[PDB]
Each structure stands twice: as C-alpha cells, then as structure tokens.
Amino acid sequence: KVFGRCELAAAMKRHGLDNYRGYSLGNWVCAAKFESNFNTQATNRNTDGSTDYGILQINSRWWCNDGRTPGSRNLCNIPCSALLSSDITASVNCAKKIVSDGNGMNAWVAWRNRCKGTDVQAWIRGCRL
Ligand SMILES: [Cl-]
Ligand SMILES: [Cl-]
Ligand SMILES: [Cl-]
Ligand SMILES: [Cl-]
Ligand SMILES: [Cl-]
Ligand SMILES: [Cl-]
Ligand SMILES: [Cl-]
Ligand SMILES: [Cl-]
Ligand code: NA
C-alpha cells in the first residue's frame, strides 16, 4: 500500500507514535517519506547482506527475521514480511523499540541527513488530525 501524507499521519497517531520518546508526528512522517516514499512494500538490500523492510526500512541485522542474514538478531520478534503489510501495526511497534535503543531517531540515517533540524511540522500541515 502507498499511503497519502495526511493518511499516514493519521494512522501513525492512532497507533501512538505522535510524540513517542519526544519526537513529534512530523518527524515520523518525514522519516517515512525519505525511507520508503510512503510505500509499505519497499525493500532494499544492504552491502553486508542484510535487508531493510517497509515504511520505515527496518533492518534484518537486528530487528526482524528473514532467514538469510547470518549471525543476526530478531529483537522485534517478527518475520520481516510482517513489516510489508498494508496494516502498519508491526512497523510502528518495532519502530518504538528502535527509537528507545539509546540514539533516538538517529538510528534512521535518512532522518538524520534529511529531516533532523528542518521544519518537520510542514509534513503534517493542513491535515485533519
Ligand atoms: Cl508527499
Ligand atoms: Cl510536527
Ligand atoms: Cl537469518
Ligand atoms: Cl535470497
Ligand atoms: Cl533475537
Ligand atoms: Cl520468523
Ligand atoms: Cl494501518
Ligand atoms: Cl532522543
Ligand atoms: Na534477523
């Protein structure tokens, strides 16, 4: 599923991500935009053989099981495939554990490089929330 901007903002809020660990809704929408262009089925292979999955590009090295990343962990206790669903629950619950890990939203390299410090409120501007 490819979400619209305000549509994803609404789903993220419903699942309790708005201000989670102090990060406003706009930061989460901005991260989704540059990680997946709002497409739940996005995937991207890393140089190390791991793979990033879903709207927030969660990596198989630590967070989900794909059966093909040697010596990895599955800290979210899920198959990486659950991260590609039209329903975002699995992605949001796993993102909650990632953003709690010590480095905040810097865990997402695209948020640091493209969203951090910017006018992130622009991502939710005009949305009926
Ligand atoms: Cl957009
Ligand atoms: Cl915001
Ligand atoms: Cl594996
Ligand atoms: Cl394969
Ligand atoms: Cl594990
Ligand atoms: Cl599994
Ligand atoms: Cl949803
Ligand atoms: Cl923080
Ligand atoms: Na894994």
Domain 1-129: which CATH class?
Answer: mainly alpha
Find tokens 């791991």 and name the residue.
50
Determination approach? X-ray
Residue 89 corresponds to which tokens in the numbers above? Answer: 């629950």
Q: Give the three-class secondary structure for 120.
A: helix
Q: Do 56 and 64 form a contact (C-beta atoms < 8 A)? A: no
Ligand 7 centroid – CA 79 distance (Å):
18
State how far the Cα of 106 lies from the Cα of 7, in Å rounded to an integer.
25
State how far the Cα of 17 lies from the Cα of 113, in Å rounded to an integer.
21
Ligand 6 centroid – CA 79 distance (Å):
4
Is 87 assigned a catalytic role?
no
Ligand 9 centroid – CA 67 distance (Å):
7
Q: What angle do CA 58, 77, 50 make, to 5 degrees?
A: 40
State how far the Cα of 29 lies from the Cα of 56, in Å rounded to an integer.
10
Q: What is the dihedral of CA 59, 61, 63, 69, to 10 degrees?
A: 100
Q: Give the relative orientation of helices 5-14 and 25-36 as an angle to the nearest 10 degrees.
A: 120
Q: Do 34 and 5 form a contact (C-beta atoms < 8 A)? A: no
Residues of the binding site for substrate = 101
Resolution of this entry, Å = 1.9
- State how far the alpha carbon of 57 is from the alpha carbons of 2, 4, 64, in Å: 14, 17, 11
Q: What angle do CA 59, 98, 117 make, to 5 degrees?
A: 100
Closest CA to 90 of 69, 106, 76: 76
